[PDB]
Amino acid sequence: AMSALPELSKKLNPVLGYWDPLNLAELNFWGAGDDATVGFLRHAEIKHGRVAMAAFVGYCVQSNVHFPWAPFNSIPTNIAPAEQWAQLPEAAKWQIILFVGFLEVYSEHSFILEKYGQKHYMKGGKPGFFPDFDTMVHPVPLNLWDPLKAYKGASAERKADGLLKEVNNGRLAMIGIMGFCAEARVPGAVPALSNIAHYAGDPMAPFAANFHLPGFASXXXXXX
Amino acid sequence: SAKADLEAFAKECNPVVGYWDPLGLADLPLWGQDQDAVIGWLRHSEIKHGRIAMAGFVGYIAHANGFRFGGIGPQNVVPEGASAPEVWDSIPFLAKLQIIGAIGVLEHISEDKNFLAADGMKHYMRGGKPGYFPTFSANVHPMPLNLFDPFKWSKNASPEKKAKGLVTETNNGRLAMLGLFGFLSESKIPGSVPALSGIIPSYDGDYMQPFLPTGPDTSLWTIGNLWA
Amino acid sequence: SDMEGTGPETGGKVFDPMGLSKIASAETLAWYRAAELKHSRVAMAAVTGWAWVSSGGPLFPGYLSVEQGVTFESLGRDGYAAWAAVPEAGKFQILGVIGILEILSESAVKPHYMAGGTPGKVPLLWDPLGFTAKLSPETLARKRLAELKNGRLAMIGVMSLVSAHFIPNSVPLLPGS
Ligand code: CLA
Numbered sequence: 001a002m003s004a005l006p007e008l009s010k011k012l013n014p015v016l017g018y019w020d021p022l023n024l025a026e027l028n029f030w031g032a033g034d035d036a037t038v039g040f041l042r043h044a045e046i047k048h049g050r051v052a053m054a055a056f057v058g059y060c061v062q063s064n065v066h067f068p069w070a071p072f073n074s075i076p077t078n079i080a081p082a083e084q085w086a087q088l089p090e091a092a093k094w095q096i097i098l099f100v101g102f103l104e105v106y107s108e109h110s111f112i113l114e115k116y117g118q119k120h121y122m123k124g125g126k127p128g129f130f131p132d133f134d135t136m137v138h139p140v141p142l143n144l145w146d147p148l149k150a151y152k153g154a155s156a157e158r159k160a161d162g163l164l165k166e167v168n169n170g171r172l173a174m175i176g177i178m179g180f181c182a183e184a185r186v187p188g189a190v191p192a193l194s195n196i197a198h199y200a201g202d203p204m205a206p207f208a209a210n211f212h213l214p215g216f217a218s219x220x221x222x223x224x
Numbered sequence: 225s226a227k228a229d230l231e232a233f234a235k236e237c238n239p240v241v242g243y244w245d246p247l248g249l250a251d252l253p254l255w256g257q258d259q260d261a262v263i264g265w266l267r268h269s270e271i272k273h274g275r276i277a278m279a280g281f282v283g284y285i286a287h288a289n290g291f292r293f294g295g296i297g298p299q300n301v302v303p304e305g306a307s308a309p310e311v312w313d314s315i316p317f318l319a320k321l322q323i324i325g326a327i328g329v330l331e332h333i334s335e336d337k338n339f340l341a342a343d344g345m346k347h348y349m350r351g352g353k354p355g356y357f358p359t360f361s362a363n364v365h366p367m368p369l370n371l372f373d374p375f376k377w378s379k380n381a382s383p384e385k386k387a388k389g390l391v392t393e394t395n396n397g398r399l400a401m402l403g404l405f406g407f408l409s410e411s412k413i414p415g416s417v418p419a420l421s422g423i424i425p426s427y428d429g430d431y432m433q434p435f436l437p438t439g440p441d442t443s444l445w446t447i448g449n450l451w452a
Numbered sequence: 453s454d455m456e457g458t459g460p461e462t463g464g465k466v467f468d469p470m471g472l473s474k475i476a477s478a479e480t481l482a483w484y485r486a487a488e489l490k491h492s493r494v495a496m497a498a499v500t501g502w503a504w505v506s507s508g509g510p511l512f513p514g515y516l517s518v519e520q521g522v523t524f525e526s527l528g529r530d531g532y533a534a535w536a537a538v539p540e541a542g543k544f545q546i547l548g549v550i551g552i553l554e555i556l557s558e559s560a561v562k563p564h565y566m567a568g569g570t571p572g573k574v575p576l577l578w579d580p581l582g583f584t585a586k587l588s589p590e591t592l593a594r595k596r597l598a599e600l601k602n603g604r605l606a607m608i609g610v611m612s613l614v615s616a617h618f619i620p621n622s623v624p625l626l627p628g629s
């Protein structure tokens with residue numbers, strides 16, 4: 001609801017609560033009521049925070065080291081991590097993006113999410129509900145959220161505190177990852193760091209150069 | 225009714241001057257359209273002229289000092305230092321067309337009865353508030369935030385504060401009209417106003433012709449520029 | 453008046469800035485709808501044909517008057533060049549079939565669209581296979597609205613093509629030939 005967002009923001013920060021200069025809590029840009037917009041915005045914020053904090057940890061890990069499994073060193077020797085991503089095989093990037101899309105279409109589907117006992121976030125579900133992976137006859141050893149258990153005995157208040165902590169952590173980590181990408185692309189952007197370097201090509205581009213693909217890889221005429 | 229409101233508004237604009245209508249314009253029937261509609265049209269024209277004059281004054285200062293937004297956009301074609309009349313001389317011709325088209329879109333939204341009845345109010349020539357721009361709850365696709373108050377800084381002010389704001393808006397608009405035309409008069413005839421002599425250079429083109437020096441056809445677009 | 457046609461993108465209201473109503477009767481509105489629907493369908497066929505011919509398309513395999521030596525490929529991928537390269541006999545056969553069909557459309561429906569009737573509903577030439585023979589009347593109104601919006605877009609499309617052929621570099625995305 002509209003009143004719940006100010007309470008959640010005050011729980012996240014008591015000094016500054018309900019900070020929306022752009023408002024955005026009344027723009028019904030889906031035409032499905034005010035609650036649907038609030039649920040979409042909360043889910044987008046939480047997803048962006050999770051992805052951004054995981055990307056920050058991954059950039060910190062892969063900016064210095066690699067994984068010794070199967071010739072994963074020539075790709076790690078491609079300067080910046082974004083150039084390493086652009087230097088990965090086409091099948092690798094395709095399967096990674098399709099894997100993430102499979103997780104997204106599993107989470108958003110409001111019949112598997114109904115098997116977990118909740119609903120879609122635009123229809124009253126909680127913001128961020130990647131559910132248990134028990135829907136098909138293919139026995140999975142571990143699920144997505146809490147893979148090696150260790151969270152069954154958690155309390156409701158502890159869950160709410162952890163949710164607020166994760167929201168604030170992603171709130172910081174989105175700006176952190178954006179600053180890392182900006183310093184990678186345009187030097188002198190991040191004034192508190194001068195160590196990260198090398199170009200990223202186009203940072204918002206999954207396919208580049210060696211990616212052949214069925215046409216439409218017109219990397220010519222780029223922008224800033 | 226409308227004339228008495230003009231008398232009152234002129235009193236709070238300047239109590240010393242008051243109602244100053246030498247050329248009797250608050251009595252001419254323009255299109256055979258009564259008194260109140262003529263008064264509303266005149267007030268709306270005054271307020272629109274004043275707002276455009278204020279925005280043009282600030283934009284003239286920004287262009288003459290040199291205040292380019294950034295890269296890639298239409299500021300790349302305009303040379304570094306050209307005076308304010310020449311920044312509407314080197315932007316692309318399609319950029320001028322789309323700027324004037326968006327201004328016309330805003331005018332049409334301002335007088336569309338469907339946009340105006342969505343807020344419960346009528347035309348300024350039919351008993352409305354002159355100079356009022358409507359909200360955007362009539363578009364077809366939802367607009368993030370309206371034009372008058374883009375953020376919610378307003379809407380908690382008292383109606384008396386709104387009336388004082390309207391009076392200040394009208395007075396500042398008239399003064400900005402005088403200032404902007406002082407700029408334009410110095411740009412054409414030397415020594416028109418005394419303070420700006422030698423500050424603003426001379427211009428040769430026509431100020432009333434939007435597309436007499438047509439801008440270049442430069443297509444500033446990358447990534448998917450399939451339209452040449 | 454109310455009619456069909458009105459939906460979103462105008463707010464559920466009739467789009468009519470300059471004139472063209474309050475001078476029209478029921479017969480005039482019926483003719484307006486009939487002309488709009490005929491223009492709609494002709495323009496839809498026109499954009500579909502132009503898009504299939506000039507862009508790509510496997511093209512018709514055959515001869516097209518083997519006696520004259522013309523081929524289907526000899527007309528070229530340009531359109532006004534191809535139509536001028538269609539034989540005069542083929543042009544006349546197309547125009548004659550169209551004229552026969554429309555004379556029978558005028559004379560065959562007994563409530564004429566300007567004497568009652570429904571404008572745009574022509575005898576014959578519609579669904580021979582009965583795909584739309586089981587649709588609900590509420591579904592039929594949606595498809596009529598889709599047809600109207602489609603035809604308006606296709607009219608704009610055909611005139612874009614014609615303007616860019618006669619005036620190069622007009623319709624900026626559309627090429628100069
Ligand atoms: C185009 C801009 C514009 C418009 C539409 C209006 C409209 C109006 N003004 Mg206003 N005004 C303006 C600019 C404008 N003003 C400027 C720049 C000033 C400061 C000098 C004022 C100062 C002012 C006062 C002090 C008062 C008004 C008032 C009024 C209202 C009725 C009086 C009237 O006859 O109208 C104004 C007359 C015209 C706009 C004349 C039309 C233009 C003519 C045809 C061209 C003349 C050009 C000519 C070269 C000028 C010679 C200047 C010099 C040699 C004398 C009306 C709503 C009265 C009021 O408060 O009601 C709300 C009032 O008492 N005006």
Ligand code: CLA
Binds near residue numbers: 462
């Ligand atoms: C010649 C084709 C044609 C015809 C006969 C009609 C007829 C009609 N339209 Mg329609 N329309 C058309 C094309 C046409 N339309 C196109 C191409 C568009 C897309 C922009 C629309 C969009 C449209 C909307 C959004 C609505 C209508 C409505 C209507 C109905 C009432 C309007 C009226 O009284 O005017 C009928 C009389 C005429 C149209 C005569 C034409 C007048 C001059 C000669 C046209 C000149 C225009 C100019 C040359 C165009 C430039 C080229 C162009 C590609 C830009 C009526 C049945 C309304 C409706 O359904 O209400 C029930 C309604 O809401 N139309």
Ligand SMILES: CC(=O)O[C@H]1CC(C)(C)C(=C=C/C(C)=C/C=C/C(C)=C/C=C/C=C(C)/C=C/C=C(\C)C(=O)C[C@@]23O[C@]2(C)C[C@@H](O)CC3(C)C)[C@](C)(O)C1
Binds near residue numbers: 158
């Ligand atoms: C009780 C219970 O159930 O168990 C608990 C504990 C337990 C097991 C751990 C849990 C878990 C799971 C996990 C894996 C939790 C970990 C999550 C993770 C990985 C969280 C990363 C955040 C990354 C951040 C904040 C990055 C900030 C980044 C920042 C702030 C910046 O970069 C800013 C900055 O760059 C600028 C802009 C300029 C620079 O010059 C200066 C700096 C660098 C400052 C549970 C289940 O959740 C809860």
Ligand SMILES: CC(=O)O[C@H]1CC(C)(C)C(=C=C/C(C)=C/C=C/C(C)=C/C=C/C=C(C)/C=C/C=C(\C)C(=O)C[C@@]23O[C@]2(C)C[C@@H](O)CC3(C)C)[C@](C)(O)C1
Binds near residue numbers: 279396402406407
């Ligand atoms: C002898 C000789 O030559 O002398 C010369 C001297 C000199 C100086 C050269 C000359 C000149 C030029 C002049 C005088 C030019 C004047 C220009 C002028 C008078 C320009 C007004 C701008 C107003 C703006 C932009 C308003 C913004 C308004 C804004 C941004 C808002 O709406 C905000 C706000 O409303 C909300 C949303 C809610 C309110 O609660 C609070 C406020 C109000 C903040 C002359 C005329 O040539 C004469």
Ligand SMILES: CC(=O)O[C@H]1CC(C)(C)C(=C=C/C(C)=C/C=C/C(C)=C/C=C/C=C(C)/C=C/C=C(\C)C(=O)C[C@@]23O[C@]2(C)C[C@@H](O)CC3(C)C)[C@](C)(O)C1
Binds near residue numbers: 473
């Ligand atoms: C609601 C709606 O839809 O509208 C409704 C309402 C409304 C509008 C009232 C209606 C109406 C009335 C209408 C439309 C009336 C239209 C009247 C109209 C259109 C009147 C043209 C005159 C042109 C003349 C006399 C030109 C002479 C030109 C002459 C004599 C020349 O020698 C031309 C010249 O070139 C030569 C040959 C050689 C050169 O040397 C140049 C010159 C220029 C000298 C309708 C019809 O009821 C429809």
Ligand code: KC2
Binds near residue numbers: 279372389393394
């Ligand atoms: C070029 C843009 C521009 C400029 C430079 C400008 C300057 C000032 C100044 C400073 C001199 C003041 C003090 C002031 C104050 C008010 N403005 Mg203005 N304003 C601009 C644009 C608009 C638009 C689009 C609208 C608007 C309005 C109001 C109302 C509400 C009155 C009410 O709610 O009763 C008040 C109090 C709204 C309206 O209602 O106008 C009748 C409306 O829609 N304004 N405005």
Ligand SMILES: CC1=C(C#C/C(C)=C/C=C/C(C)=C/C=C/C=C(C)/C=C/C=C(C)/C=C/[C@@]23O[C@]2(C)C[C@@H](O)CC3(C)C)C(C)(C)C[C@H](O)C1
Binds near residue numbers: 370371448449
């Ligand atoms: C490349 C490609 C193609 C393509 C394409 C596409 C989609 C190109 C699209 C280009 C596009 C979409 C360009 C938009 C510009 C929008 C602007 C400038 C808006 C400014 C808006 C502004 C300045 C709004 C300002 C305000 O709103 C604010 C912020 C607050 C309000 O209170 C007040 C107003 C309203 C004034 C092909 C060829 C079609 C197919 C091919 O396969 C791939």
